[PDB]
Amino acid sequence: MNINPYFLFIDVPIQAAISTTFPYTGVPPYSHGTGTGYTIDTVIRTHEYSNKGKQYISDVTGCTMVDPTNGPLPEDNEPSAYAQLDCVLEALDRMDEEHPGLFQAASQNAMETLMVTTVDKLTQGRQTFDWTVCRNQPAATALNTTITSFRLNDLNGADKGGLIPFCQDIIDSLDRPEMTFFSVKNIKKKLPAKNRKGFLIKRIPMKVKDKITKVEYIKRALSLNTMRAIATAGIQIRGFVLVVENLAKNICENLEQSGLPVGGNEKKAKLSNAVAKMLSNCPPGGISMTVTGDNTKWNECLNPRIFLAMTERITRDSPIWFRDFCSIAPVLFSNKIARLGKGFMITSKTKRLKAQIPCPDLFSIPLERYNEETRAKLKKLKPFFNEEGTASLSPGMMMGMFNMLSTVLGVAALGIKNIGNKEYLWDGLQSSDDFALFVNAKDEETCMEGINDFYRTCKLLGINMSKKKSYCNETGMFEFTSMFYRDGFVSNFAMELPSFGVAGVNESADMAIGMTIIKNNMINNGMGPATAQTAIQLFIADYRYTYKCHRGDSKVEGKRMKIIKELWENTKGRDGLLVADGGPNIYNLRNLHIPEIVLKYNLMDPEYKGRLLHPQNPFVGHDYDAVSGTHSWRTKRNRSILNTDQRNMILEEQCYAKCCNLFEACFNSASYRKPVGQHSMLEAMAHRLRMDARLDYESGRMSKDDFEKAMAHLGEIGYI
Amino acid sequence: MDTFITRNFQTTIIQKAKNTMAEFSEDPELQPAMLFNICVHLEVCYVISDMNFLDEEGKAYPQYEVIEGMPRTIAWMVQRSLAQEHGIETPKYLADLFDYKTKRFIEVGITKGLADDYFWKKKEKLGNSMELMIFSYNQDYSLSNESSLDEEGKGRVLSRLTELQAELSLKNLWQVLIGEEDVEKGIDFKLGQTISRLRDISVPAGFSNFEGMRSYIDNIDPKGAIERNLARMSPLVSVTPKKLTWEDLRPIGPHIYNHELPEVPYNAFLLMSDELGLANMTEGKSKKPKTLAKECLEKYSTLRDQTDPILIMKSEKANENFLWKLWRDCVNTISNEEMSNELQKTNYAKWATGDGLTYQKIMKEVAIDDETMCQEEPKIPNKCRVAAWVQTEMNLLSTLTSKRALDLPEIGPDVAPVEHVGSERRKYFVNEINYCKASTVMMKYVLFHTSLLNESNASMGKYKVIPITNRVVNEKGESFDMLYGLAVKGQSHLRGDTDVVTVVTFEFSSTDPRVDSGKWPKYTVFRIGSLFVSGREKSVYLYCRVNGTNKIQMKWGMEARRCLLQSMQQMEAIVEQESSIQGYDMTKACFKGDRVNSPKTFSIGTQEGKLVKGSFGKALRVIFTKCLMHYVFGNAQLEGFSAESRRLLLLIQALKDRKGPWVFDLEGMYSGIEECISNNPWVIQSAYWFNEWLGFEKEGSKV
């Protein structure tokens, strides 16, 4: 009997059968390498779909620029980035007329939020491209480095605290003839280390001051570095994109078509409501069709100039300063420069050699030495390449940075609802990459005529529908963002599942975080009761393994398990003991939002309650919900190097190695005989030698003459 | 603070202020000062618009229209309508109040110091396009027009604000009272020359400066532009709708049926169906892997003391002698007495995994100067035909063995009906797949990957021997500690987590590779000895294979335990659909069957070319095995193929339900799917099964 798993589809609808095909909503490790080649291909494709536009030379950054907007309309079904401004303006006009007082209110709310916001908001983000060092650093570190450089350059926006002064100082820094900043430089090492020679070589960083001309800083600020996001943007762009996205979110929240920022069962409600609404107003005897459309090269076709036009149209009645503030982001994106990453690698098999060619030296060697695909890619990329290992890139959107504005543009495309006053009405939903289109007509022929008209219209707006990944069927069954809807039933394609291990804070905190994660997964991603209970079981298993807190009545052995077993033997209320103390777990679906301390309080032993919740215990000392007890301990978090200046100047003197060598013998002869606790190493040596001489004389290793000689020398030391 | 807010103002005012301020898209709790300011402002404007009234001619006995408090959209549209009807300029900022007499919008504000400076700076902000009245807690008033407010209104507002000021200091609230200008400190935003130039050069073709674009956007009426643009667009821009039919669908990737191409090799990390665990019954205590391996080898001493290898098969490049000597070193280290599991004879380990053959990196300048250093072409995956061993893998991993390896902790008592349903589903699932061989293989995989990850904690520049062990339990209750072989992990000097650390694994097996020569083109296999189970001699081979994986791959292997949750979610989705057909839960009925219903049966596979049915338990086991294989055989090809087969399957489903599906570019979908069928065994077998099932659906849809 040869199994055939696909045969399940015979007895089960495919929508349910393929539920949760991918356990991971993130990124796999085996995805096609996103290196210099991938970014080169991305820029090549971005410039390829817009090569019929206007090509010119930027007078600021001196880089090639391509502008496809208002360019010739496509004559082929291939992707096109030529979005006419008039069509976009008309679509925005239609949206505004349909929703009176929407753009004004959204712009007002966005500007008020910007006025009340603070620079600290910029720290909530993923890896950010720091320009001072030209790398990827955490948001907080990047913001701190930018602030320090601004202070060095007589720019103190962060001092005022507001975000508006910070962005004003950013755009002012874009005007300084020379920009001075701090940078980190690594220098080799010569300090001792015991492997076989008491000598090792490493890298130590130091802070230095570096200055850059105006054009260099201008190019650096617009740079987009690469680490399914393809690149990250520095700090000079973060505030403006934040404001523009807040505006777009304010607009979208009141757009019934927008599929964002819906999350949870609200998504299912929106899907079913849209289907029901479209079916209700279907013409008597007409036909309703549904397209699960997808967009190819979504972010490689949208143009920053079109986003600038959308921002200008939306904020047509708003203070001029806010209009400029909103416009600062699209103009920055329209001049974005991509960084190609590390570079390539070329090898010689005959001599068994290999080397890494960095981006600036990409063209330093004949193209014949690159494989076919890289040769062609470099040949095509030559015009859009800079001498500093960067590529000019005017068009494109390099994945998600204006997702809300993309959704707004898609909703505008969906809001036309008719072309030529034909016998079809279209509508649907769209969330920043994917759209579901519902069209009502008389016969399927007119429905497909309407679908064709919608395809042409979105082409006019620069949105390219995917013919190779889209299909149409009678309304009632479709998909929308990995969520299959079928005549009321709803299923998910990919659902994130709890990862192995505890959260990584502490016993009570880890338990609370795990339970709240399970609860959130149930609420949002739609995890069934049995799956949630199994997740609880797995989390308990992992927690017990990590904290070595198996059941008190178990037969396992461990350093902590002996005390756990003794406590279990001495305790009467064994149902009230916490899991961390080998007690029984009692968590279930109905009580996934209650801390275990509160759950078990009524069953705890009063003596155990006092010991556990002692107001002054030595462990606690000085989101999720838990109880502050003896299980809220803190782990030692102290590493790296402090006292950097003193340590560096000491290590750079000379005699440190001799001190280490003298220390090593005596204080390694025994595993631990160090009077540690801030004792000066000289004092510890004096005490150690005094004790060694005492022991030598007592055992007879030394005569009285050597004894007295040693005590005189030690007398000169000062600790005797 | 909030207590003062709820005590000093009526509930309606508090609710209006709260719902108007919550539109800021921020937490309304941690910052209540602006809530107090907005409540006071709302009260002031409400009072201002409650005493003066107009009539058909304007008798003073309303005159003030309130804009604040109402929704921002409604307020803005009302303000625009008023401006249009009165033929006056519309203020750019939402005015808080309008006057019917002056035919001008007006604004109000509350401060703490003298109101003259506040009025002057507000005038500078808004110029002269809006009138204003301002009052201050310290008895100060300012009016742009003296004929705006009467004595009664000003006096009442002054009394109210003075009372509020006096009461604030009674409960230590005046100290924490924030001013009013802070929320509007930033009103000056001047663009520099460079940014202005960048903006000017970033306009669509047809404009010279951004001023032209702004004027064009703010003035031109683009109505009817879409129709004009569409009329002249070429007809070639068409989706080309095409109604789909059963005959339109065709088998995907027919090349897999090409006998010329080679069979797909076995590239899984660990043997799944061919494993052989050296059972060693134990009480149940937990012991270090080294001691467990030592005891297991002691029990099967004959295999441990094997020194003459009977080579049976060899890999194309690997050297049998080096692998055998490395295995001998590994067993010697396992059988010694030192606690550490560290290899001491690094010679064969270093020379066997090709760790000395890595190229040496030189400075980029030499490479640029050198002419013989050229980039190497990418080794695109080969193309392979259907592999017959994947079917056997799926068949065997779905069988029920005599041992189980799952022991999950307990959960609290179930009370709610949903908890009871979930517990019943869990009971049925575990009972069905407790002993399934797939569960044991999954546990071995996850445990081995966890041990590999742990060993990389501090030992990175040293070779580590790791036994491939497992803890198993049988029906009778006695638990065994199985050893499936060993594996030595090399060094990873580089600190990167995505850096391959070569590990060579020697796994025992009882299957002669000569039977399926194409299944092991990558393995080096010896013959160590022979076991006896029922008085009968069965040979034992040692499959030795070199492999390379990184820390992220270790994390992926560790997370590979998610197949349990994945399979449970799939089964729960099936049950939820079955229950959604009805209005009540269908768990027991679809598993065991009630009086009304019958035990649901699923089409499992094929027997002599004929369909075969089976219980829901078999379907659950097949689902679990499929999920485990998907996780184990996962590469970019597999995920891409699954993502595109999603669309193909959805179209097939639409065809089944008589929904009349239409496809625009079918060949595009087919090319996208076939782009991923190159060399993955799982992808190729999935394509084969999809073709078989599509044929079955075609032949069964004609009835």
Side-chain angles (χ1 to χ4, degrees), chain A residues 1 7, chain B residues 605-613 696:
Chain A
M1 192 266 256
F7 279 28
Chain B
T606 81
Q607 223 190 125
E608 277 71 5
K610 95 191 191 64
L611 193 71
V612 70
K613 312 279 276 293
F696 259 107

Side-chain angles (χ1 to χ4, degrees), chain A residues 34 38-39 42 225-232 300 398-400:
Chain A
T34 84
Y38 210 68
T39 178
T42 283
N225 199 319
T226 194
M227 326 86 74
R228 288 185 182 168
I230 295 165
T232 82
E300 318 180 35
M398 50 41 60
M399 312 309 275

Side-chain angles (χ1 to χ4, degrees), chain A residues 338-350:
Chain A
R339 298 178 70 77
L340 304 175
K342 290 178 180 180
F344 285 130
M345 191 207 61
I346 57 169
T347 79
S348 163
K349 304 172 171 293
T350 66

Side-chain angles (χ1 to χ4, degrees), chain A residues 1 11 21 59 67 86 90 108 112-113 175 249 317 321 369 371 456 468 472 486 500 533 588 590, chain B residues 24 72 76 80 93 194 197 216 222 225 367 370 375 395 413-414 419 426 559 566 603 657 662:
Chain A
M1 192 266 256
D11 285 306
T21 308
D59 57 2
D67 175 19
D86 304 321
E90 168 152 16
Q108 164 150 79
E112 286 190 315
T113 297
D175 263 354
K249 149 168 172 289
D317 278 3
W321 72 264
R369 288 161 67 166
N371 38 7
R456 295 158 67 80
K468 309 185 173 189
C472 197
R486 176 195 193 275
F500 177 99
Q533 292 179 15
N588 210 336
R590 69 190 193 287
Chain B
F24 280 27
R72 291 284 178 77
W76 266 105
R80 288 162 73 79
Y93 283 79
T194 298
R197 280 299 315 160
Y216 175 97
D370 199 316
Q375 201 194 348
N395 284 237
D414 313 337
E419 296 167 357
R426 269 180 36 255
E559 301 319 317
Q566 196 194 8
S603 324
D657 282 352
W662 286 52

Side-chain angles (χ1 to χ4, degrees), chain A residues 484-597:
Chain A
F484 315 115
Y485 174 93
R486 176 195 193 275
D487 293 320
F489 185 59
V490 175
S491 147
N492 261 44
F493 186 59
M495 158 187 338
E496 187 73 23
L497 307 168
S499 74
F500 177 99
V502 301
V505 194
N506 58 64
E507 295 158 357
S508 83
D510 287 358
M511 177 54 105
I513 286 168
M515 291 305 78
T516 206
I517 270 178
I518 298 300
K519 178 190 69 157
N520 270 4
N521 230 321
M522 277 201 117
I523 278 167
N524 291 337
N525 305 28
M527 221 163 49
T531 309
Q533 292 179 15
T534 312
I536 293 164
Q537 288 189 328
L538 297 197
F539 175 81
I540 290 152
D542 296 358
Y543 183 90
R544 280 173 176 165
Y545 174 110
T546 282
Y547 283 102
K548 329 180 282 162
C549 55
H550 287 266
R551 291 195 65 149
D553 51 12
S554 82
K555 215 73 72 193
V556 85
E557 298 173 332
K559 185 145 96 199
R560 183 187 212 174
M561 280 298 322
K562 195 185 293 189
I563 310 106
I564 282 165
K565 283 165 174 168
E566 292 184 25
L567 168 59
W568 174 281
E569 290 301 329
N570 292 324
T571 313
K572 273 56 158 184
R574 299 185 170 174
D575 310 287
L577 293 174
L578 301 192
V579 176
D581 303 348
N585 163 69
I586 60 175
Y587 262 107
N588 210 336
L589 298 177
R590 69 190 193 287
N591 53 26
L592 279 186
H593 60 282
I594 303 168
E596 64 181 332
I597 288 96

